[PDB]
Design an enzyme around this catalytic site. Structure first.
Site, mmCIF file in Angstrom:
data_model
loop_
_atom_site.group_PDB
_atom_site.id
_atom_site.type_symbol
_atom_site.label_atom_id
_atom_site.label_comp_id
_atom_site.label_asym_id
_atom_site.label_seq_id
_atom_site.Cartn_x
_atom_site.Cartn_y
_atom_site.Cartn_z
ATOM 1 N N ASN A 1 37.156 -0.051 -4.447
ATOM 2 C CA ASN A 1 35.826 -0.700 -4.426
ATOM 3 C C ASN A 1 34.967 -0.242 -3.245
ATOM 4 O O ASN A 1 35.440 -0.203 -2.098
ATOM 5 C CB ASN A 1 36.035 -2.201 -4.399
ATOM 6 C CG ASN A 1 34.740 -2.928 -4.526
ATOM 7 O OD1 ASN A 1 34.191 -3.334 -3.511
ATOM 8 N ND2 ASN A 1 34.266 -3.026 -5.746
ATOM 9 N N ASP B 1 46.497 -5.346 3.340
ATOM 10 C CA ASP B 1 45.343 -6.135 3.861
ATOM 11 C C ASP B 1 45.653 -7.641 3.834
ATOM 12 O O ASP B 1 44.970 -8.363 4.583
ATOM 13 C CB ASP B 1 44.044 -5.776 3.115
ATOM 14 C CG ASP B 1 42.789 -6.420 3.690
ATOM 15 O OD1 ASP B 1 42.408 -6.056 4.819
ATOM 16 O OD2 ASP B 1 42.205 -7.273 2.997
ATOM 17 N N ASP C 1 28.443 -7.330 -8.510
ATOM 18 C CA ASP C 1 27.872 -7.497 -7.146
ATOM 19 C C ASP C 1 27.097 -6.246 -6.707
ATOM 20 O O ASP C 1 26.594 -6.254 -5.571
ATOM 21 C CB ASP C 1 28.938 -7.942 -6.139
ATOM 22 C CG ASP C 1 29.941 -6.869 -5.754
ATOM 23 O OD1 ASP C 1 29.921 -5.760 -6.388
ATOM 24 O OD2 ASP C 1 30.759 -7.150 -4.867
ATOM 25 N N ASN D 1 30.414 -2.898 -10.728
ATOM 26 C CA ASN D 1 30.738 -4.333 -10.615
ATOM 27 C C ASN D 1 29.448 -5.155 -10.609
ATOM 28 O O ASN D 1 28.413 -4.610 -10.208
ATOM 29 C CB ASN D 1 31.554 -4.478 -9.336
ATOM 30 C CG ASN D 1 32.784 -3.587 -9.287
ATOM 31 O OD1 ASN D 1 33.110 -3.002 -8.251
ATOM 32 N ND2 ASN D 1 33.473 -3.502 -10.400
HETATM 33 RH RH LIG Z 1 40.374 -8.343 3.916
#
Ligand SMILES: [Rh+]
Ligand code: NA
Ligand SMILES: [Rh+]
Ligand SMILES: [Rh+]
Length: 129
Positions: free
Chosen positions: A59, A101, A48, A46
């Site tokens: 990720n 999440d 980042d 990615n």
């Molecule tokens: Rh989160």
């Protein structure tokens, strides 16, 4: 391992993903198809500096440790390499945490852009589940 479509559907069902947080099995197979092409070994860097790992492209910025993602978390408490195994147990356990999440399956960008709102039941056509 490059899973078959119904092979992956069967493993995903065995590990309790069919209707997990209300997402039908077809959603999960569709996500795997466009995230990884059903390849457990898929990795993608990615911008980042994080990496996405495995059949559901999990990720390293949040979910797993790869040792090269500064100021990252490891909320699934696993090495990212665990998410590349022929056995999808660790990817499924971690995916259950991700989808719980807050943003549901929108966490998977290929799901949001290629599966969400489509006829996802097509992904389990012909499978003896
Ligand atoms: Rh989160
Ligand atoms: Na990490
Ligand atoms: Rh299981
Ligand atoms: Rh189990």
């Amino acid at each position: 391992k490059v899973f078959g479509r119904c092979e992956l559907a069967a493993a995903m069902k065995r590990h309790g993903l069919d209707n997990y947080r209300g997402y039908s099995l077809g959603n999960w197979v569709c996500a795997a198809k466009f995230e990884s092409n059903f390849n457990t070994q898929a990795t993608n860097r990615n911008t980042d500096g994080s990496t996405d790992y495995g059949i559901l492209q999990i990720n390293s910025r949040w979910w797993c440790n790869d040792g090269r993602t500064p100021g990252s978390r490891n909320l699934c408490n696993i090495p990212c390499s665990a998410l590349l195994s022929s056995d999808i147990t660790a990817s499924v356990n971690c995916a259950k945490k991700i989808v719980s999440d807050g943003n549901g399956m929108n966490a998977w960008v290929a799901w949001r852009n290629r599966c969400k709102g489509t006829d996802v039941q097509a992904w389990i056509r012909g499978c003896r589940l």
